[PDB]
Write a protein that binds this ligand. Structure first.
Ligand SMILES: CCCCCCCCCCCCCCCCCC(=O)O[C@@H](COC(=O)CCCCCCCCCCCCCCC)COP(=O)(O)OCC[N+](C)(C)C
Ligand SMILES: CCCCCCCCCCCCCCCCCCCC(=O)O[C@H](COC(=O)CCCCCCCCCCCCCC)COP(=O)(O)OCCN
Lengths: 487, 67, 76, 93, 51, 615, 72, 46
């Protein structure tokens, strides 16, 4: 009988044990960190098997009293939506430990401690049902990622990236917190189930929804505030750059799918056109901006912004197709962006350029990496048979059930997405070599050729047979779309 | 293994990175920023809202306020 | 390829021509045959063919579903 | 424990629910929502069954498909008129 | 083969010219036979016994 | 048996690409050819079991997307239209693989070529056999990707990279169109399967709200599908990638840029015959664009002097006639032209590649002169190909190329006379350039350099057998298929095509047409041949080289540069978007105004506000 | 064809790891076993878990209830 | 800029030729009556 609490406790135990041992025995530290991450991953997979997809009510709930009145308490629990995010965040962490495996003697035990703390905290975010405490853990990731970015980051601009990242998550976060307090005082509890079954004032839902969106429009790279992701993502370590675009960008969308869509249904309808316009202009502007980039990191950071913005079009189009495609494209992006940023990281850790023009015509020298990069940028294209296509086409279908203009612009997003993706591919892997500044360089060793194998198998499994993933969520998605819609 | 990194590249790379020092609110560029900052969002907003209005007109249901 | 003889080249280098490729070719054909046998078994297992042939075709020697879909009312 | 079979659910509509004041009774809200979604999925599967029937029609029908399957076409379309969460035509259940 | 004043060309293969000539002859024969049979049909000289 | 046809090329390519080191540069090629040859053999078996033995087989592997009535599955559709397309695609692929063993024998990257074409063949088999839009879209995007890859075969070629990228651009525009069409089908019929839309596509007659006005659904869906297929079928909207995509290897330009993917959109629109039929508005634009392209390619291809480029315009002209024959609700004639063309056009490219291989790749008709007796076999091969291209009477070309114009006249509408005029006129230009190719090469006093003449080296055995097979095909296939595909009521399209009773101009055409029109294409072809002879062998002092100052040399530049459309489109769309991708956004957005009044531009007043509160 | 060829071994080294001397193992990496065993367990638990789990869902339940209800 | 006018001019030739087809009125000069079929022009078949 494996419950939800053991999954949360495993990274905690791994971190506490790791602090006991000293730093001289570096091999023990890395071995124990990897072992803890892998057993957490296995536990997450075990939780998948024993998941009832028929019922609409939440799975394993562990309640730990927080206030003396049991007014609000840690109410853990997974559903069709939160399960796959938990699996993805358990899967990404061992990869994070494995990418920087060679440099562990340079980082130290603070690196694995920070990453395991991140795993614990990120798991706690997705699988909990208390609105207020979810806010606490929602921006609790500030400290560990601030440490990760600042301590091991850029050369001298690492300070500014940390400040922009930390500043963008303050005003909107606390402006959300004000709405949290108004909800707590108005109803009385922050339990999600109780808050769903409450009559909110017609004028009140507008203010609360705006406050929620203000703190989610920063995590999801919306039009006003999305410039942090490129700069704070290039000025970030490779393992810190693979969860920043792998998990953090999901907090805004998941928060929309949990505490925004259900609680404020008619407010969602009234604010629907505005979100459509924002997402469409974000897609178009980011697509046009990313095709004249020379930074080796921002080139796909903008692709991540475009995908996340396209997610909201079908996430806010209340529909079984739209929301299902939303989470499918979300997982697909969590895999493909992670793979692309790992490719950029391995390219950077050999040559240390952070440019695009330096690399050129290296297919004759690194053929394995060439094939892997081709497959990853091929998945980014959203080919049928790859991960992105099923989800993204489902989003297009769902939005075209509701509206006929904005998501046509969303589809026009991919008329240039694929173009600049292959153009970017052809900057590097094509043409004649330039051995004026590329004297010596090697191909992927045993570690980083095996690290992509889970990515490859997950990508093809998404592409050719996504029925198993859609199977476990159709109850939760349909319950989500029909809430507060009696007729 | 590290690249030679010839000097005639990092200057242009930083110029692309540090473009924030070249902006003086020129009138032509002020119109250029204003149009793509406001008008196109307004035009597309009218597009979606009128698409919803025309969809609702055929069904006969009253139009949502859509504030 | 002066340096190109050092890369692995998963699909083959510039001009590989290994010492013994004919045996690899033969084992490749054997593997393809062995892996396409289950494909044939699955294909013969699932094939409706609602209409009976006008003349005896090389089919119905391994396919047993013929004229099994002229009952289009008990369909799930 | 498990029934190791199909997840049997109560076909009976839950009691204590009033359309005029749904939010008055919270404990009865979730099961009514579940019942509504289950009935919507029943309609969806009925439409899928009709689609499968016309699927198997078109192969046997031949050139003159209109003649002997026209009756089933209307049956399939009327099901598609009140489909789930789809186009602007929202059913009133 | 032989050179004229600095350019020499290999003799065309026997198994190429022979097949080319024979296949050209047989397609010419097929064209002329088709002209003999249904030539009046496509030129309106006579209809294929349908009126 | 039937699952095998689509997976033998895929499995063979997968093993020959993952373990290409084991099988070497020749084992991989021979095994890929073996796999595709047995795929074609089972394709012929399926043709006998399905076409002659008329009984369509349908098999379903597993649902692909099992969401709310979006049940796209891995099912396969094997009808008469499918099998006739298979017996073309896999047969030509096998013969091109045989041709490429010897042609791609001196090249280093032999196994990669074989694996590329084999995965491509798998993708197109998935396209043809696909039962629903999503599977069809899967194969369609796969074949687009593989075409891009083969254009990018020599990565070090800077021009080839740009050509492949532009081909991807136009293919992606087509992807936009076809994806919107496919999804629009679902919002109407709540399905994507072929057998449901065809069974119930006539019931709805409602108008939608598609983002600008109220438009009928069926007309809008057909227009969107046409916008999807314009890139793939190389129509007036976007077809600038064919002549510029000849920078790739000849066999792929021989195999695929001439046979099936260029007609992939043709096969797609023929497959959904009972969806375009209910929208008479769509057929108007189909015929209009078909005539437009059949005239554009024919006019632009008369002044070209490149061996592999001049024939691409001929292929575009053929695509134009195919689209026109589709727009007349006579797709049976269109697919008849498809099967006739896939033989002789591929034969012409294969003969040209055999010639270019022996002459050390000198594709400039300004150079090659009279050495026809040096290359008699290839001369006969391309003579058969070109004569079938002309529509030589009582050959495989005449049975479609004259019938299409005859059907064009017999329909009386505004665009009908326009399209008939363009089709009649294009014959002259097509014959002119197809005969100038045979005149300026191998029929004029020689101008090629001695270094190329001395090489000789007639085409070996590997790349001559496929040429022989295509020659014997494009001499009797048209006759053996004229009766059995279009026999004035044959039982060959029971479910593959839906022929509308009203738009059914087949019986009245053959009898009510005047005899004069049934022979005027022959007269136009003879006139074109005589004009080519005059300008290339007798009167070439002024008719071939005119030293005019103005208003006449600009005409020479007009047809040669393809109406300058390859430059107008670039500077007006691609250049504009490239400039404005950065000029507006990266300057006056992102970092900038959102930064100067945002985080640290000027809102950092606290630094200026620090030394004012300690007073 | 008839000739056997040359290049006794394919060029390059897999994973860039130089082959060890004969008679010695590959000297598996310190994480090699902990991660390979992880992959093995994940593959087996997905293979036998996602298939031996009951096919309980809302699609099959709706299928059964639609078959039972359409008859009336 | 000179090349632009050819695209407008070239398309002008086609619409000018398209205008000629409009002025020619090919539709109304059919030498045949509309097709007649048994069973009310296949009403039950449609
Ligand atoms: C969402 C994905 C859907 C499936 C798409 C599959 C399509 C194939 C994807 C890979 C295509 C191959 C592109 C690889 C990169 C191209 C350049 C390259 O690096 O090639 C490599 C590897 O070449 C390959 O292409 C091998 C990769 C496999 C290609 C065949 C793929 C078959 C499996 C995919 C399709 C299976 C069927 C569908 C599965 C359901 C080395 O080539 P060499 O010939 O060795 O050149 C030597 C370099 N140098 C001169 C410098 C020494
Ligand atoms: C280089 C060597 C690589 C070797 C890889 C294997 C060799 C084969 C290579 C081909 C690629 C195979 C990839 C898997 C494709 C599976 C396609 C069929 C899946 C499917 O639909 O059937 C399901 C089987 O579940 C299953 O059991 C599927 C198990 C697959 C395990 C893959 C593990 C990937 C882990 C990645 C984690 C990423 C997490 C991201 C969220 C259940 O079907 P059903 O619904 O009908 O139920 C049945 C109830 N009777």
């Amino acid at each position: 009988y494996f419950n939800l609490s053991g999954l949360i406790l495993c990274p905690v135990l791994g971190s506490i044990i790791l602090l006991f041992i000293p730093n001289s025995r570096i091999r023990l530290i890395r071995l124990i960190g990897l072992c803890a991450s892998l057993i957490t991953f296995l536990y997450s997979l075990v939780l998948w098997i024993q998941f009832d997809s028929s019922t609409a009510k939440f799975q394993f709930v562990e309640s730990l009293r927080w206030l003396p009145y049991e007014n609000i308490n840690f109410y853990l629990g997974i559903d069709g939506i939160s399960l796959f995010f938990v699996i993805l965040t358990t899967f990404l962490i061992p990869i994070c430990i494995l990418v920087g495996w060679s440099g562990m003697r340079s980082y130290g035990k603070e690196y694995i401690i920070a990453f395991l703390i991140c795993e614990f905290l990120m798991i706690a975010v997705f699988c909990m049902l208390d609105l207020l405490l979810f806010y606490v853990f929602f921006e609790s990731v500030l400290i560990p990622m601030f440490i990760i970015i600042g301590v091991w980051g850029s050369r001298q601009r690492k300070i500014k990236a940390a400040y922009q990242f930390f500043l963008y998550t303050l005003l909107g976060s606390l402006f959300m917190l004000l709405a949290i307090l108004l909800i707590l005082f108005q109803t009385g509890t922050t339990d999600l189930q109780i808050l769903l079954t409450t009559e909110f004032s017609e004028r009140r839902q507008i203010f609360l929804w705006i406050a929620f969106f203000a703190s989610f429009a920063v995590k999801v790279p919306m039009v006003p505030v999305h410039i942090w992701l490129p700069e704070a993502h290039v000025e970030a370590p490779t393992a810190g750059s693979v969860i920043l675009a792998g998990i953090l960008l999901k907090f805004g969308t998941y928060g929309f799918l949990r505490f925004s869509i259900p609680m404020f249904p008619e407010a969602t309808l009234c604010f629907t056109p505005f979100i459509y316009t924002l997402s469409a202009i974000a897609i178009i502007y980011t697509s046009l901006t990313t095709l004249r980039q020379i930074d080796l990191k921002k080139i796909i950071a903008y692709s991540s912004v475009a995908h996340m913005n396209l997610v909201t079009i079908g996430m806010f189009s209340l529909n079984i197709q739209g929301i299902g495609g939303s989470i499918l494209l979300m997982l697909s992006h969590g895999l493909v962006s992670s793979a692309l940023f790992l490719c950029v990281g391995v390219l950077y850790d050999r040559h240390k350029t952070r440019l695009v023009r330096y690399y050129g015509g290296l297919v004759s020298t690194m053929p394995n990496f060439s094939t892997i990069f081709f497959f990853f940028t091929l998945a980014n294209m959203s080919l049928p048979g790859t991960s992105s296509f099923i989800g993204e086409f489902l989003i297009l279908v769902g939005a075209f059930q509701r509206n006929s203009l904005v998501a046509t612009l969303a589809a026009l997003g991919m008329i240039l997405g694929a173009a600049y993706s292959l153009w970017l591919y052809n900057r590097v892997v094509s043409g004649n070599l330039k051995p004026d500044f590329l004297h010596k360089f090697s191909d992927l060793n045993g570690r980083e050729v095996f690290i992509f194998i889970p990515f490859l198998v997950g990508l093809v499994w998404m592409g050719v047979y996504p029925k198993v993933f859609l199977d476990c969520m159709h109850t939760s998605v349909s319950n989500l779309v029909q809430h507060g819609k009696f007729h | 293994m590290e690249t030679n990194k010839n000097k005639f590249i990092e200057d242009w790379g930083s110029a692309r990175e540090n473009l924030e020092h070249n902006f003086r609110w020129t009138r032509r560029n002020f119109a250029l920023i204003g149009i793509f900052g406001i008008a196109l969002p307004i035009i597309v907003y009218k597009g979606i809202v009128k698409d919803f209005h025309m969809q609702d007109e055929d069904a006969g249901r009253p139009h949502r306020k859509f504030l | 390829g002066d340096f190109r003889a050092k890369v692995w080249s998963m699909t083959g280098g510039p001009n590989c021509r290994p010492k013994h490729w004919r045996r690899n070719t033969a084992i490749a054909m054997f593997g393809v045959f062995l892996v396409c046998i289950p494909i044939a078994k699955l294909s013969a297992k699932l094939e409706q063919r609602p209409h009976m042939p006008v003349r005896p075709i090389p089919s119905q020697i391994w396919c047993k579903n013929f004229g099994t879909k002229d009952d289009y009312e008990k369909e799930h | 424990g498990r029934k190791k079979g199909l997840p049997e659910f109560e076909e009976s509509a839950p009691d204590g629910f009033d359309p005029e004041n749904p939010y008055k009774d919270p404990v009865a809200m979730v099961e009514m929502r579940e019942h509504i979604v289950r009935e919507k999925w029943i309609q969806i599967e009925k439409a899928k069954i009709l689609r499968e029937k016309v699927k198997w029609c078109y192969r046997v029908e031949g050139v003159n498909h209109y003649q002997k399957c026209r009756h089933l076409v209307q049956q399939y379309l009327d099901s598609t008129r009140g489909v789930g969460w789809g186009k602007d035509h929202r059913p009133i259940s | 083969g032989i050179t004229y004043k600095g350019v020499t060309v290999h003799t065309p293969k026997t198994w190429h010219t022979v097949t080319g000539k024979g296949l050209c002859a047989v397609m010419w024969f097929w064209i002329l036979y088709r002209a003999k049979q249904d030539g009046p049909v496509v030129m309106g000289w006579r209809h294929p016994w349908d009126g | 048996m039937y699952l095998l046809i689509v997976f033998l090329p895929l499995l063979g390519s997968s093993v020959a690409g993952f373990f290409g080191r084991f099988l070497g540069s020749e084992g991989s090629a021979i095994m890929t050819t073996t796999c595709v040859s047995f795929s074609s053999i089972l394709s012929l078996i399926a043709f006998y079991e399905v076409a002659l033995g008329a009984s369509a087989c349908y098999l379903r592997i597993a649902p692909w997307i099992s969401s709310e009535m979006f049940d796209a599955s891995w099912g396969f559709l094997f009808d008469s239209l499918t099998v006739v397309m298979l017996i073309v695609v896999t047969f030509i692929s096998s013969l091109v693989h045989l041709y490429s063993i010897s042609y791609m024998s001196e090249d280093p990257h032999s196994p990669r070529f074989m694996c590329y074409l084999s995965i491509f063949t798998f993708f197109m088999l998935m396209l043809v056999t696909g039962d629903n839009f999503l599977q069809l879209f899967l194969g369609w995007e796969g074949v687009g990707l593989a075409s891009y890859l083969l254009i990018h075969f020599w990565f070090t070629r800077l021009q080839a990279d740009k050509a492949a990228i532009k081909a991807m651009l136009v293919n992606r525009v087509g992807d936009f169109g076809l994806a919107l069409g496919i999804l629009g089908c679902f919002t109407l019929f709540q399905t994507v399967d072929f057998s449901t839309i065809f069974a119930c596509a006539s019931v709805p007659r409602n108008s939608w709200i598609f983002c600008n006005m109220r438009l009928n659904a069926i007309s809008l869906i057909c227009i969107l599908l046409f916008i999807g297929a314009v890139g793939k079928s190389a129509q007036i909207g976007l077809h600038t990638w064919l002549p510029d995509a000849m920078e790739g290897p000849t066999p792929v330009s021989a195999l695929i840029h001439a046979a099936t993917m260029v007609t992939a959109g043709v096969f797609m629109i023929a497959r959904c015959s009972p969806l375009f039929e209910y929208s008479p508005t769509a057929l108007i634009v189909i015929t209009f664009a078909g005539a437009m392209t059949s005239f554009l390619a024919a006019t632009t291809g008369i002044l070209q002097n490149d061996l592999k480029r001049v024939i691409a315009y001929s292929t575009c002209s053929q695509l134009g006639y195919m689209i026109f024959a589709c727009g007349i609700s006579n797709y049976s004639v269109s697919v008849f032209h498809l099967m006739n063309h896939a033989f002789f056009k591929a034969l012409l490219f294969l003969s040209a590649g055999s010639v270019i291989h022996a002459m050390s790749d000198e594709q400039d008709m300004r150079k090659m002169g009279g050495l026809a007796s040096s290359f008699p076999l290839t001369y006969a091969m391309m003579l058969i190909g070109s004569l079938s291209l002309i529509g030589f009477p009582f050959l495989t070309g005449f049975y479609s190329k004259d019938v299409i114009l005859e059907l064009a006249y017999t329909k009386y509408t505004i665009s009908g006379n326009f399209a008939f005029w363009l089709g009649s006129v294009s014959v002259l230009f097509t014959s002119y350039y197809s005969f100038r190719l045979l005149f300026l090469t191998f029929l004029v006093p020689t101008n090629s350099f001695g270094r190329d003449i001395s090489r000789c080296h007639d085409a070996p055995i590997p790349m001559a057998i496929p040429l022989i097979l295509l020659a014997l095909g494009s001499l009797f296939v048209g006759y053996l298929a004229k009766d059995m595909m279009i026999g004035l009521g044959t039982n060959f399209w029971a479910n593959s095509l839906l022929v509308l009773p009203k738009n059914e101009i087949l019986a009245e055409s053959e009898f009510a047409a005047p005899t004069i029109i049934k022979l005027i294409p022959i007269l136009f072809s003879t006139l074109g041949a005589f004009v080519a002879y005059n300008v290339n062998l007798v009167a070439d002092q002024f008719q071939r080289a005119f030293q005019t100052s103005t208003f006449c040399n600009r005409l020479y530049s007009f047809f040669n540069k393809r109406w300058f459309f390859d430059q107008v489109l670039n500077d007006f769309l691609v250049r504009s978007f490239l400039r404005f991708g950065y000029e507006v956004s990266f300057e006056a957005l992102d970092k900038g105004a959102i930064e100067i009044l945002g985080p640290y531009g000027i809102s950092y007043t606290f630094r200026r506000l620090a030394e004012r509160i300690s007073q | 064809w008839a000739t056997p060829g040359h290049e006794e071994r394919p060029k390059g080294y897999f994973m860039n790891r130089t082959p060890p001397a004969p008679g010695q193992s590959r000297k598996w990496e310190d994480w090699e076993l902990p991660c390979y065993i992880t992959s093995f367990l994940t593959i087996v638990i997905l293979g036998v878990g996602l298939n031996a789990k009951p096919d309980l869902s809302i699609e099959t339940w709706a299928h059964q209830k639609a078959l039972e209800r359409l008859e009336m | 800029y000179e090349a632009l006018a050819w695209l407008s001019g070239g398309l002008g030739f086609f619409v000018g030729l398209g205008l000629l087809a409009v002025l020619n009125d090919k539709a109304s000069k059919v030498p045949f009556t509309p097709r007649v079929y048994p069973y009310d022009n296949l009403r039950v078949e449609l």
